């Protein structure tokens, strides 16, 4: 009965979510609001029905897992007033963050996703980068701080009625790992040497460019002189940190301009590669039913989101649109992998339709993007790169590829470390910001470019802070996806330079991936 009713109710929920995302208006907001109330009512009713059951005395595995997963009411365990206040707080935080725009009062104004991120990722001026970072952090964090303590209190309350301890155990129980914290700390300690060497080189380059007045050889680099609003994957624009400028170094900025390279054909290329790997293709109506391009108006989507599945077994759409870029390819492949992960366990019950581990979603989404980013695959697709012939091109490509997927590991650890420390009552409100910078000075090597006093909720800049999503699910991915690639490159029959190995028409590798990823959460 739970499966039968949940299929239709969640299909309706996801249809309403799509209608909001593509047609942002007042009617869509109201429809999402009262369908959220409806889904909360349904989940409360079915969780209460499940609580009359017992899971331990039951003798089975699949139904035992279903009952255990539905025992918790998540955010529906609150009373009427508390649940309503919590949902209103979440909606208000999301609204005041998505529409939050900081600008010079002269009249010209800029929004976060379209310009500000780009306006620093393409700029190399100290003052402009400082103004952008400071203004965004100030405005967004100050706006969020007015509500964030209430959300923390209410989510702790929800976890405590659910049966967990202060909303840290709740988010850590998704992994079913009692020793998760120690394991992740050990992983970060193991990754410390390479990351430290990379940070040393980056600080060398930044001191070479900006001089010594702002960045000195001894001392952490400022957090805004890296390329991102948050420096999660810093210096993805590496022109200032090029080891040696080489003739055969790839550009990958004009290879998708003179051939047209519309998002539709590029998504078709990604799907063709995925099919060549050896898994089932996406049904064709995805192409003619979804949106993957820029809109015809000024209102298209929320700032940033992920793939959307309607759990109906027919709709597997993708929302992301990022014009035309090289990083567009990596995010598109990420979303292709995520959607195929959503698709592969269609036959499983909708209760287990969540994936083996929140990290595994991004892991399988990004493993193929990692494999296709190699210069050999680019040589086989629209480009002429040195591949593995010249070692200098190989080390340059390794540096470009390790500016990402590394220097993101410390951030993906830090965000959820701070969130766990604040959820479990270890961090008092009065210094909500302070610890966040202390962690920035401990796990990462960043310091505040301007003295950040209390009253500046600097953790409010990240979208994942007010949206209530467990950022650490990315960390596991960025640690585990590489561990995937190795195994897949084993099926290729050759290892050699694993940093340049490629997966292409390796049918056995795809079969091995599918024989396990199909298990889902069962």
């Amino acid at each position: 009965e739970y499966d039968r009713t949940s299929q239709v109710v969640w299909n309706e929920y996801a249809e309403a979510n799509w209608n909001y995302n593509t047609n942002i208006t007042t009617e869509t907001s109201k429809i999402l609001l009262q369908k959220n109330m409806q889904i909360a009512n349904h989940t409360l009713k079915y969780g209460t029905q499940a609580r009359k059951f017992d899971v331990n005395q039951l003798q089975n595995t699949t139904i035992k897992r279903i009952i255990k997963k539905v025992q918790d009411l998540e955010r529906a365990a609150l009373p009427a007033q508390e649940l309503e206040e919590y949902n209103k707080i979440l909606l208000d935080m999301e609204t005041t963050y998505s529409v939050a725009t900081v600008c010079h009062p002269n009249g010209s104004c800029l929004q976060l996703e379209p310009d500000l991120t780009n306006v620093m990722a393409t700029s190399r001026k100290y003052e402009d980068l400082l103004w952008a970072w400071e203004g965004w952090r100030d405005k967004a964090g100050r706006a969020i701080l007015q509500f964030y303590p209430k959300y923390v209190e209410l989510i702790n309350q929800a976890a405590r009625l659910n049966g967990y301890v202060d909303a840290g155990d709740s988010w850590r129980s998704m992994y079913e790992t009692p020793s998760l914290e120690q394991d992740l700390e050990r992983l970060f300690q193991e990754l410390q040497p390479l990351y430290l060497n990379l940070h040393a080189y980056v600080r060398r380059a930044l001191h070479r460019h900006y001089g010594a007045q702002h960045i000195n050889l001894e001392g952490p680099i400022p957090a805004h002189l890296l390329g991102n609003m948050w420096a999660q994957t810093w210096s993805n624009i590496y022109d200032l940190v090029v080891p040696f400028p080489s003739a055969p170094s790839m550009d990958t900025t004009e290879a998708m301009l003179k051939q047209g390279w519309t998002p539709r054909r590029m998504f078709k290329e990604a799907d063709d590669f995925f099919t060549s790997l050896g898994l089932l293709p996406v049904p064709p109506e995805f192409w003619n039913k979804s949106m993957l391009e820029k809109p015809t108006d000024g209102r298209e989507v929320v700032c940033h989101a992920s793939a959307w599945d309607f759990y109906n077994g027919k709709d597997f759409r993708i929302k992301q649109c990022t014009t035309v870029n090289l990083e567009d390819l990596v995010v598109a492949h990420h979303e292709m992998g995520h959607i195929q992960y959503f698709m592969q366990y269609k036959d499983l019950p909708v209760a287990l339709r969540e994936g083996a581990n929140p990290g595994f979603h991004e892991a399988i989404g990004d493993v193929l993007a990692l494999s296709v980013s190699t210069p050999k695959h680019l040589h086989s697709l629209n480009l002429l790169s040195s591949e593995g012939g010249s070692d200098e091109h190989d080390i340059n490509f390794l540096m470009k590829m390790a500016l990402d997927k590394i220097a993101f590991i410390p951030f993906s650890y830090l965000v959820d470390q701070w969130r766990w420390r604040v959820f479990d009552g270890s961090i008092t409100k009065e210094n909500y910001n302070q610890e966040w910078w202390s962690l920035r000075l401990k796990y990462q090597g960043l310091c505040p470019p301007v003295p950040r006093t209390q009253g500046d909720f600097d953790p409010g800049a990240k979208f994942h802070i007010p949206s209530s999503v467990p950022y650490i699910r990315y960390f596991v991915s960025f640690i585990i996806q590489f561990q995937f690639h190795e195994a897949l490159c084993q099926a290729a029959g050759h290892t050699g330079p694993l940093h340049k190995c490629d997966i292409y028409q390796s049918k056995e590798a795809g079969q091995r991936l599918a024989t396990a990823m199909k298990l889902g959460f069962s």
Partner: protein, 53 residues
């Protein structure tokens, strides 16, 4: 014998209580709160990233 037995022997409750300090300093606490609000000052250190030089 364990610590709680002795702690009850001196005082009467086998618990570490911080209310004795509060009641001990109650006149000073009240006077100092009154003086602080009269002088218009905020508690805490809400400029934590501060160093004299």
């Amino acid at each position: 014998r364990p610590w709680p037995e002795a702690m009850q022997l001196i005082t009467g409750q086998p618990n570490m209580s911080a209310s004795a300090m509060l009641s001990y300093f109650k006149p000073l606490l009240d006077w100092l709160r009154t003086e602080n609000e009269l002088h218009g000052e905020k508690l805490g250190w809400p400029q934590y990233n501060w160093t004299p030089n």
